[PDB]
Amino acid sequence: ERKLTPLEHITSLDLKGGIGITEALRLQMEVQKQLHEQLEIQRNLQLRIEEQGKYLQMMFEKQN
Amino acid sequence: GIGITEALRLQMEVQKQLHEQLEIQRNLQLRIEEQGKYLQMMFEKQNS
Amino acid sequence: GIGITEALRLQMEVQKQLHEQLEIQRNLQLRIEEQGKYLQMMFEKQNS
Amino acid sequence: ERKLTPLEHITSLDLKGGIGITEALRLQMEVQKQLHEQLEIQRNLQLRIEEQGKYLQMMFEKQN
Ligand SMILES: [Mg+2]
Ligand SMILES: [Mg+2]
Numbered sequence A, D: 001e002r003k004l005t006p007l008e009h010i011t012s013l014d015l016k017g018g019i020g021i022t023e024a025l026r027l028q029m030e031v032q033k034q035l036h037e038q039l040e041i042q043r044n045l046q047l048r049i050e051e052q053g054k055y056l057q058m059m060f061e062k063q064n
Numbered sequence B, C: 001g002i003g004i005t006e007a008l009r010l011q012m013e014v015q016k017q018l019h020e021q022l023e024i025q026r027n028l029q030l031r032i033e034e035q036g037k038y039l040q041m042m043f044e045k046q047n048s
Helices: A012-016 A020-063 B004-047 C004-047 D012-016 D020-063
Strands: none
């Protein structure tokens, strides 16, 4: 729901003034920061999932 | 190993981090769309 | 460098791969929930 | 919309038969395969985003 700011929203009026390219580059930094963040959550997820795996496997073998 | 309690905490944390990626991915997708129409407006300028 | 055409293709590919993560993340989240209630049923057995 | 199969859906009747743990471990393999897939798309996304970045920056400097 975090909607675009005017600095992020590329309008036709922005193009008639020649700032569409700079607004597109602004989006580039933000997008690429949000890939890094969502990548960092990936590594965290993969680490939290991996320890549930150890816990569940350690109990499966308690039955055995 | 880890307790049953710690196992539920990891469980609660995993669910919220999934919800967090969903929200980040919705934001990131909204911004990819803007670059989409910019490229299109510059492409559609290129044809005409 | 890359053409304007290749730039639009990367654009179209990025949007679909985002849509694909959304669908994978919805599947993965549904399965995390099942482990959630299993742990809870085993936890709620542990109290009683 | 890819809903759980009965092999994936852990019921109370599964617990009364002692197969909840194995179904939970089945979920573990699938979840962890889907983290790897969503991680692989991350790397692909980060690489496709990075080349739009080069293209947009190379045009910003053409104006200059
Ligand atoms: Mg604007
Ligand atoms: Mg079942």
